[PDB]
Amino acid sequence: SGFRKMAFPSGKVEGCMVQVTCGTTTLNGLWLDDVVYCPRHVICTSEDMLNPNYEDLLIRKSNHNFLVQAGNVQLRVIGHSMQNCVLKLKVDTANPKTPKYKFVRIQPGQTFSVLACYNGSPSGVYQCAMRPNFTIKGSFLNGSCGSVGFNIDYDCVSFCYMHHMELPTGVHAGTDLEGNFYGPFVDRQTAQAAGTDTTITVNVLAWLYAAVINGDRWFLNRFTTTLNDFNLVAMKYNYEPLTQDHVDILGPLSAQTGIAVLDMCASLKELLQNGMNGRTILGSALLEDEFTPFDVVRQCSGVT
Amino acid sequence: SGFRKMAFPSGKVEGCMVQVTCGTTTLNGLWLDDVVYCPRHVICTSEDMLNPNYEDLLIRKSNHNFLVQAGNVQLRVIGHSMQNCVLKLKVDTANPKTPKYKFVRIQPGQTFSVLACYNGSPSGVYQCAMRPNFTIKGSFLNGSCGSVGFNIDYDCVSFCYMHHMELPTGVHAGTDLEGNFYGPFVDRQTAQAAGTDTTITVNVLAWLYAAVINGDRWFLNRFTTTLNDFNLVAMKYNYEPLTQDHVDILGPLSAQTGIAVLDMCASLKELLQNGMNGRTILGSALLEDEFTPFDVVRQCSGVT
Ligand SMILES: Cc1ccncc1NC(=O)[C@H](c1cccc(Cl)c1)N(C)C
Numbered sequence: 001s002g003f004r005k006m007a008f009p010s011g012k013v014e015g016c017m018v019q020v021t022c023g024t025t026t027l028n029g030l031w032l033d034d035v036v037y038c039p040r041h042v043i044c045t046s047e048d049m050l051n052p053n054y055e056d057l058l059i060r061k062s063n064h065n066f067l068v069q070a071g072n073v074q075l076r077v078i079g080h081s082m083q084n085c086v087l088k089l090k091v092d093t094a095n096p097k098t099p100k101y102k103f104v105r106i107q108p109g110q111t112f113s114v115l116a117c118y119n120g121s122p123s124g125v126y127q128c129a130m131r132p133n134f135t136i137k138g139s140f141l142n143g144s145c146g147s148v149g150f151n152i153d154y155d156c157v158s159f160c161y162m163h164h165m166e167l168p169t170g171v172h173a174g175t176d177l178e179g180n181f182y183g184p185f186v187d188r189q190t191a192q193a194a195g196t197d198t199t200i201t202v203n204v205l206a207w208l209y210a211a212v213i214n215g216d217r218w219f220l221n222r223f224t225t226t227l228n229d230f231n232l233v234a235m236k237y238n239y240e241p242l243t244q245d246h247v248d249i250l251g252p253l254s255a256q257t258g259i260a261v262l263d264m265c266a267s268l269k270e271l272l273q274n275g276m277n278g279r280t281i282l283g284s285a286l287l288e289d290e291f292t293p294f295d296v297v298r299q300c301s302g303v304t
Numbered sequence: 305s306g307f308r309k310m311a312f313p314s315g316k317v318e319g320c321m322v323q324v325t326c327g328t329t330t331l332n333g334l335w336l337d338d339v340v341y342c343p344r345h346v347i348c349t350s351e352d353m354l355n356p357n358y359e360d361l362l363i364r365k366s367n368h369n370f371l372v373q374a375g376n377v378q379l380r381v382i383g384h385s386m387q388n389c390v391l392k393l394k395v396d397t398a399n400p401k402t403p404k405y406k407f408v409r410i411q412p413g414q415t416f417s418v419l420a421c422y423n424g425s426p427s428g429v430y431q432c433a434m435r436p437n438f439t440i441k442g443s444f445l446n447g448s449c450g451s452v453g454f455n456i457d458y459d460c461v462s463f464c465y466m467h468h469m470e471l472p473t474g475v476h477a478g479t480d481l482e483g484n485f486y487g488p489f490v491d492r493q494t495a496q497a498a499g500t501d502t503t504i505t506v507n508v509l510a511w512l513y514a515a516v517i518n519g520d521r522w523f524l525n526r527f528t529t530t531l532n533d534f535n536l537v538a539m540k541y542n543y544e545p546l547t548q549d550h551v552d553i554l555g556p557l558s559a560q561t562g563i564a565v566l567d568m569c570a571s572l573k574e575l576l577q578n579g580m581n582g583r584t585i586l587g588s589a590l591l592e593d594e595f596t597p598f599d600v601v602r603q604c605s606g607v608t
């Protein structure tokens with residue numbers, strides 16, 4: 001029993017973190033096999049970030065200009081290329097701590113763990129959701145660029161995020177491991193619109209199922225609703241519209257608790273319209289949306 | 305910017321987790337040097353747990369009855385002893401992944417990360433506070449016994465908790481790594497009173513300082529208070545009394561923000577008496593108490 005915002009064990013990722021320095025700038029790199037991945041803005045100075053021409057800035061750089069250090073050992077850079085907003089530094093040594101890995105571009109609403117790093121050293125691990133607006137609400141200071149997000153299936157690490165930028169609103173933006181930004185963001189010091197964000201409805205419902213499994217059942221009621229009726233309430237409260245695909249994904253949780261998905265929707269509708277009346281659910285006084293149905297099943301069954 | 309409930313990187317602890325089996329029961333062990341540590345209830349069957357005589361149950365056991373497996377390798381047990389509520393299994397091989405470590409008995413109100421494990425394999429990592437009543441609100445299922453709590457200073461892991469029991473109320477109890485339970489708990493299947501819990505006042509204030517540092521300042525007011533006036537409010541709302549030692553510990557945060565500790569106390573007093581009026585602080589609709597002043601400094605400065 002109990003339900004916590006749990007991150008994956010970070011060990012396999014800690015063994016991949018390196019420090020990358022280019023001129024005056026130092027940030028984090030991810031060392032997988034014989035390639036070190038890092039944000040391309042490592043080649044910029046403060047005068048460049050306003051509107052950098054990354055192609056021209058990278059032309060003034062040679063393999064010997066990129067300093068890569070893994071703990072105390074210096075890696076030898078034998079190749080360098082830019083792929084979208086990431087730099088790929090070929091080194092002469094494969095990382096002996098390279099786990100089984102994949103690069104994946106996650107969907108908005110999905111979750112992942114972040115290993116925050118500074119100077120190539122890990123400081124902490126936390127669980128994040130990729131917001132429907134493609135930002136993440138993380139915890140990152142200057143020096144954290146290059147820190148990554150990931151999921152773990154058995155022994156395989158699926159890297160899904162690389163931290164690049166803090167927006168003027170304090171929210172975070174970054175790329176997949178091919179260097180493609182999530183959302184409309186660009187890697188330059190300009191005011192950037194993070195669109196309207198919505199609450200991940202299927203995740204709130206998954207968390208309500210976690211609450212029932214763990215004993216928090218005060219919010220269950222004698223009501224039901226329909227997808228169209230529920231979605232009229234979701235639009236009013238800026239919640240993502242619920243689809244039959246979402247209902248299908250909540251099937252295991254509906255089977256486990258014996259509570260039909262539309263009956264849980266009616267509980268959510270009443271919570272949206274009336275609030276919590278000063279009560280809490282799983283230690284929270286607000287509707288939590290950063291747990292997927294998969295996360296709830298995983299945490300409630302004990303998958304390692 | 306941003307503030308998250310962050311756990312320490314779990315890597316150094318993952319390399320210590322083993323599976324311990326005694327007869328029918330399997331739980332987690334912590335392998336440090338040539339000793340494997342685990343809850344002593346591994347020697348019990350379901351008939352024993354109601355009122356076990358651990359001394360007599362351990363007498364029916366030999367070194368060969370304790371099966372220890374680290375990943376796929378079997379460890380050879382050459383000694384066994386009981387220390388309070390923990391068993392210490394001497395093995396013939398020192399763990400080559402043993403980090404620099406210490407055993408510490410943490411104080412109530414202090415925080416630590418938990419690496420939840422099943423069959424010797426890690427499933428997730430989360431940050432916990434030792435409640436003033438010596439329970440922890442974690443996330444543990446059957447099989448998680450032997451999972452540990454820890455803090456990390458530079459390269460040294462300070463192990464502070466070993467999970468033993470879920471109380472009928474769904475909260476968690478365990479021991480330090482010498483086998484002494486935190487609180488009045490005993491390792492037997494009996495109804496056990498977890499005393500009245502209070503909110504960790506110094507931690508709520510630390511979190512209010514984190515909120516100001518990160519831009520959430522709506523709760524700041526034109527008022528002040530005194531330790532005695534504030535403590536009249538803390539007693540009414542079952543908050544731990546604030547002492548000058550707590551004020552001293554909040555000194556770095558007071559120096560950084562320029563907000564005197566008693567002025568922050570007056571904000572807390574008004575939040576306690578009026579609620580949040582439907583607003584949030586650092587993404588929360590309730591006063592968060594599981595961040596110490598140290599955690600706030602660490603997260604806000606970037607300690608790795
Ligand atoms: C300070 C900080 C805090 C938290 N997360 C990231 C940063 N860094 C940044 O946002 C900036 C930057 C500015 C503009 C565009 C981009 Cl891609 C990056 N770097 C270059 C220092």
Ligand SMILES: Cc1ccncc1NC(=O)[C@H](c1cccc(Cl)c1)N(C)C
Pocket residue numbers: 001345353444445446447448449468469470471490491492493494
């Ligand atoms: C099921 C479970 C879920 C979460 N955390 C722990 C447990 N296990 C327990 O609480 C029990 C037990 C019962 C009584 C006393 C003690 Cl010390 C232990 N074990 C033996 C299964």
